[PDB]
Amino acid sequence: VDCTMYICGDSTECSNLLLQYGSFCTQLNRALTGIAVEQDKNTQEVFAQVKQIYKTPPIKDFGGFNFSQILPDPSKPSKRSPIEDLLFNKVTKFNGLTVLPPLLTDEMIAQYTSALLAGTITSGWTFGAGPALQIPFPMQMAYRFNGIGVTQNVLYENQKLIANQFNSAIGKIQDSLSSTPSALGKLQDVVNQNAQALNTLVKQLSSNFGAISSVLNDILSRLDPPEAEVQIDRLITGRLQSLQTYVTQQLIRAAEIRASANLAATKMSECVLGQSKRVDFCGKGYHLMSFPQSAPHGVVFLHVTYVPAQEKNFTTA
Amino acid sequence: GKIQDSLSSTPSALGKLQDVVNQNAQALNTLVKQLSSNFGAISSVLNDILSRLDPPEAEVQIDRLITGRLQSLQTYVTQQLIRAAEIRASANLAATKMSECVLGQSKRVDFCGKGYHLMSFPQSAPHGVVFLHVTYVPAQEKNFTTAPAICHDGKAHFPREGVFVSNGTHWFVTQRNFYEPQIITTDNTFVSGNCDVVIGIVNNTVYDP
Amino acid sequence: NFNFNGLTGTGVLTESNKKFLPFQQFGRDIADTTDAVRDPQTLEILDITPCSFGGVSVITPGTNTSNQVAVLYQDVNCTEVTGSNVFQTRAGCLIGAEHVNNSYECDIPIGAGICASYQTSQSIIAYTMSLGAENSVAYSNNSIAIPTNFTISVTTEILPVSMTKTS
Ligand SMILES: *[C@@H]1O[C@H](CO)[C@@H](O[C@@H]2O[C@H](CO)[C@@H](O[C@@H]3O[C@H](CO)[C@@H](O)[C@H](O)[C@@H]3O)[C@H](O)[C@H]2NC(C)=O)[C@H](O)[C@H]1NC(C)=O
Ligand SMILES: *[C@@H]1O[C@H](CO)[C@@H](O[C@@H]2O[C@H](CO)[C@@H](O)[C@H](O)[C@H]2NC(C)=O)[C@H](O)[C@H]1NC(C)=O
Numbered sequence: 001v002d003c004t005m006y007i008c009g010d011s012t013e014c015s016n017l018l019l020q021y022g023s024f025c026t027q028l029n030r031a032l033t034g035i036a037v038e039q040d041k042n043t044q045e046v047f048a049q050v051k052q053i054y055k056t057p058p059i060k061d062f063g064g065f066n067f068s069q070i071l072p073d074p075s076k077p078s079k080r081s082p083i084e085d086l087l088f089n090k091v092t093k094f095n096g097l098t099v100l101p102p103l104l105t106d107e108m109i110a111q112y113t114s115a116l117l118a119g120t121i122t123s124g125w126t127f128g129a130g131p132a133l134q135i136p137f138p139m140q141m142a143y144r145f146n147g148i149g150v151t152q153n154v155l156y157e158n159q160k161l162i163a164n165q166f167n168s169a170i171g172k173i174q175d176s177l178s179s180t181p182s183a184l185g186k187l188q189d190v191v192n193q194n195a196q197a198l199n200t201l202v203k204q205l206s207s208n209f210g211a212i213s214s215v216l217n218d219i220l221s222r223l224d225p226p227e228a229e230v231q232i233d234r235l236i237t238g239r240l241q242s243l244q245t246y247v248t249q250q251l252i253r254a255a256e257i258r259a260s261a262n263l264a265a266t267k268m269s270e271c272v273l274g275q276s277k278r279v280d281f282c283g284k285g286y287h288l289m290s291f292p293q294s295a296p297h298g299v300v301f302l303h304v305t306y307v308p309a310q311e312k313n314f315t316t317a
Numbered sequence: 318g319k320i321q322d323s324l325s326s327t328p329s330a331l332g333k334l335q336d337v338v339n340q341n342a343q344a345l346n347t348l349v350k351q352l353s354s355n356f357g358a359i360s361s362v363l364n365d366i367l368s369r370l371d372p373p374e375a376e377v378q379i380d381r382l383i384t385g386r387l388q389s390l391q392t393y394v395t396q397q398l399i400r401a402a403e404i405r406a407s408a409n410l411a412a413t414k415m416s417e418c419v420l421g422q423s424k425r426v427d428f429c430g431k432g433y434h435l436m437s438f439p440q441s442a443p444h445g446v447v448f449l450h451v452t453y454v455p456a457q458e459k460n461f462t463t464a465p466a467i468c469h470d471g472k473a474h475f476p477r478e479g480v481f482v483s484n485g486t487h488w489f490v491t492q493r494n495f496y497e498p499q500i501i502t503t504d505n506t507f508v509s510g511n512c513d514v515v516i517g518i519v520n521n522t523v524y525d526p
Numbered sequence: 527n528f529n530f531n532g533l534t535g536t537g538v539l540t541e542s543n544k545k546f547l548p549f550q551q552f553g554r555d556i557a558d559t560t561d562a563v564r565d566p567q568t569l570e571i572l573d574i575t576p577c578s579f580g581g582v583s584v585i586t587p588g589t590n591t592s593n594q595v596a597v598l599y600q601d602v603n604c605t606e607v608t609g610s611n612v613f614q615t616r617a618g619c620l621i622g623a624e625h626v627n628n629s630y631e632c633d634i635p636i637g638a639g640i641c642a643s644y645q646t647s648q649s650i651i652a653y654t655m656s657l658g659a660e661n662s663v664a665y666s667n668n669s670i671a672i673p674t675n676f677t678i679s680v681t682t683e684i685l686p687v688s689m690t691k692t693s
């Protein structure tokens with residue numbers, strides 16, 4: 001947000017006064033520029049974890065596992081998966097405000113997401129060291145099972161059940177997100193907070209801050225020029241205070257958003273591109289696998305874990 | 318040695334720390350330059366406002382300068398507090414990496430870089446820390462035949478170590494990470510369940526060593 | 527610079543797709559900014575598009591290589607800014623650079639998937655971001671890739687620890 005436009009509408013009398021405040025305003029522009037730069041870094045740290053773009057093969061020979069609801073749909077304008085369509089469908093001037101696009105867009109995020117999903121499905125943890133290796137899906141599970149202290153024999157005895165349980169859980173999440181949009185509230189809050197911060201500046205702009213008039217053309221025609229200048233300084237201070245408040249809030253929020261982006265980036269590496277032993281890190285249960293989704297200014301993950309079915313009583317020593 | 322050559326010819330490689338010192342220098346330069354501002358007042362110079370205007374007016378002009386300077390100082394402090402939170406978070410991560418990759422061997426994924434973690438070495442730096450994180454990366458990804466199990470006597474044999482592989486004539490067990498095959502033997506397998514339990518199971522010889 | 531029945535602002539005023547009661551005269555945006563007027567004499571609804579603004583982003587080569595500079599004007603069409611080398615990007619109006627249909631890596635970011643760099647007979651070129659090379663990995667459920675031999679790579683990582691102790 002540029003003071004020249006926000007405060008004066010490019011008019012000369014208040015502009016000359018703004019020039020006297022000087023760097024007092026240009027420091028606001030530097031803070032906001034710095035935040036915008038960090039916002040592209042956050043998106044890249046969270047999604048650009050693939051050094052190459054990996055793709056799901058034409059034939060999904062994955063041992064009975066349905067990844068079709070997480071992988072992108074080739075027929076759409078934007079290559080979003082069925083679950084991404086739900087995430088995007090449900091989560092949503094001459095006042096100095098300029099808003100710039102991200103470098104990394106929903107379509108390009110979706111391309112990184114496709115590589116991340118293809119990676120976890122066909123390479124798993126080998127994606128973490130050099131070019132990814134090719135592993136049969138059931139073999140990938142053998143490694144994922146041995147990695148949690150459960151012998152691979154277990155998955156083979158239950159492979160039909162594991163595939164059915166997996167496929168069901170992903171489908172139930174999609175039904176849940178569709179009927180309960182509030183489920184995605186953690187991201188809806190981000191977009192709402194930034195909209196509110198901007199709405200706050202626009203409404204405060206109309207305030208006189210105790211001055212004779214908040215309208216510049218009016219104060220200049222209403223009062224003899226030397227008094228109008230005083231009333232203009234009162235408006236300038238009030239508007240600069242609104243802008244400094246905005247910038248401070250955006251800087252504090254930038255720290256909070258960066259911390260969330262760092263955690264999200266961590267979860268992708270820990271549960272999607274490898275198999276972490278951190279306790280309850282990506283959810284309760286034994287970690288098995290995880291799949292990222294793109295989202296409007298955020299990331300959504302489906303973290304897949306195991307939970308015991310029945311706790312039977314045995315004698316021990 | 319290659320890292321040292323890189324840092325020498327490409328100083329921008331250390332930009333993450335150069336930015337810290339630049340930001341603090343800028344914050345101070347910002348206060349000094351704003352100090353000369355009149356903030357719309359008659360004069361930014363104190364001796365001048367006092368000799369220029371009758372004292373009771375000079376006091377008003379002084380309050381205008383005081384408010385403007387206090388606003389510059391509060392802005393500075395706020396920026397330093399927000400940055401202090403960011404720097405502390407970086408310091409906490411750096412401290413974590415030292416413990417995780419230098420004074421122990423962490424299993425965190427890609428935590429100190431891509432590859433298998435082997436070792437790490439800290440370096441001091443002007444208001445920061447630099448680490449050389451040493452990892453392994455596979456040299457050549459060769460294609461082998463595989464199976465989740467092989468069977469013998471009608472029962473399924475699983476590896477107790479690594480993965481079951483084949484060259485087209487015999488079955489071997491390698492490590493999960495590298496192709497260093499052992500002939501499959503009874504002594505290094507787990508047996509449980511019928512051959513038919515495992516999807517993709519191969520009928521083959523398990524050797525007695 | 528418009529003035530309709532005493533209400534003012536600066537912008538481009540074109541036919542609106544809004545409807546209104548015979549009663550009403552002006553439309554309003556947040557904090558009562560006018561976003562539509564009806565003409566006082568002509569019974570048409572006119573949409574006020576704020577007059578275009580944005581920053582000016584200059585694409586600079588290393589100066590240790592060349593003096594070839596292109597300029598990106600944010601949030602504006604190449605109908606309002608131009609020059610001979612004029613191309614429209616999603617981020618803004620780009621003048622002095624040429625466009626290429628192929629995708630490549632990203633050295634100098636424009637926005638919305640568009641990023642510039644320098645290529646040869648050198649010029650300033652805007653490219654589609656590739657997001658990296660593709661890896662056409664073959665796949666089957668009965669084969670596995672297992673590596674032979676390994677090498678050591680060392681990552682240099684720089685982290686902030688402290689600031690100047692100012693008071
Ligand atoms: C204010 O006065 C203007 C005159 O400058 C009025 O515009 C005039 O409106 C009449 C009635 O519609 C027009 O007569 C007819 O117009 C239609 C279409 O324009 C035409 O097909 C017919 O042959 C006939 O001429 C007249 O042309 C039009 N004049 C102009 C210059 O547009 C206007 O209606 C008045 N506004 C109000 C709110 O009273
Ligand atoms: C696995 O995915 C395939 C995709 O072809 C599913 O087939 C269709 O899935 C959609 C949505 O997942 C359903 O609306 C259709 O009824 C399915 N059948 C068709 C088009 O014939 C398949 O059902 C999935 N397998 C599962 C979930 O076990």
Ligand SMILES: *[C@@H]1O[C@H](CO)[C@@H](O[C@@H]2O[C@H](CO)[C@@H](O)[C@H](O)[C@H]2NC(C)=O)[C@H](O)[C@H]1NC(C)=O
Binds near residue numbers: 160161164309
């Ligand atoms: C292990 O748990 C799974 C899921 O709770 C059971 O699999 C179900 O078996 C019932 C039999 O009544 C079938 O109707 C369902 O279709 C199965 N569900 C799935 C997802 O496969 C299984 O019975 C349990 N096994 C044991 C030994 O208790």
Ligand SMILES: *[C@@H]1O[C@H](CO)[C@@H](O[C@@H]2O[C@H](CO)[C@@H](O)[C@H](O)[C@H]2NC(C)=O)[C@H](O)[C@H]1NC(C)=O
Binds near residue numbers: 485
């Ligand atoms: C697969 O590896 C086995 C190793 O067990 C090979 O069998 C050996 O073949 C070599 C010569 O090629 C002989 O010297 C050994 O006596 C054989 N060992 C056994 C246990 O028979 C086998 O030839 C390899 N197959 C292929 C296609 O390379």
Ligand SMILES: *[C@@H]1O[C@H](CO)[C@@H](O[C@@H]2O[C@H](CO)[C@@H](O)[C@H](O)[C@H]2NC(C)=O)[C@H](O)[C@H]1NC(C)=O
Binds near residue numbers: 460661
């Ligand atoms: C081993 O598997 C790799 C998987 O990356 C193969 O690489 C691809 O293989 C297909 C068909 O085998 C080729 O059409 C592609 O051009 C290969 N892609 C890349 C990026 O190399 C590799 O060819 C396989 N090696 C052997 C000897 O079969």
Ligand SMILES: *[C@@H]1O[C@H](CO)[C@@H](O[C@@H]2O[C@H](CO)[C@@H](O)[C@H](O)[C@H]2NC(C)=O)[C@H](O)[C@H]1NC(C)=O
Binds near residue numbers: 518666
């Ligand atoms: C996955 O492995 C299975 C065996 O468990 C393969 O299934 C059969 O493979 C043989 C030889 O490869 C073929 O002659 C049969 O036609 C296959 N049957 C079916 C139903 O496909 C299967 O080919 C393997 N999948 C891939 C992609 O290699």
Ligand SMILES: *[C@@H]1O[C@H](CO)[C@@H](O)[C@H](O)[C@H]1NC(C)=O
Binds near residue numbers: 471512
């Ligand atoms: C492998 O052994 C199993 C025993 O369960 C048998 O069912 C199957 O027919 C055998 N396969 C071959 C190729 O002999």
Ligand SMILES: *[C@@H]1O[C@H](CO)[C@@H](O)[C@H](O)[C@H]1NC(C)=O
Binds near residue numbers: 603604616
């Ligand atoms: C301006 O460029 C935009 C690109 O978003 C395009 O949609 C629009 O048609 C252009 N307008 C004109 C007048 O060229």
Ligand SMILES: *[C@@H]1O[C@H](CO)[C@@H](O)[C@H](O)[C@H]1NC(C)=O
Binds near residue numbers: 627
């Ligand atoms: C790029 O695509 C446009 C639109 O199809 C086409 O007119 C132009 O010839 C293409 N340029 C190159 C270098 O392929």
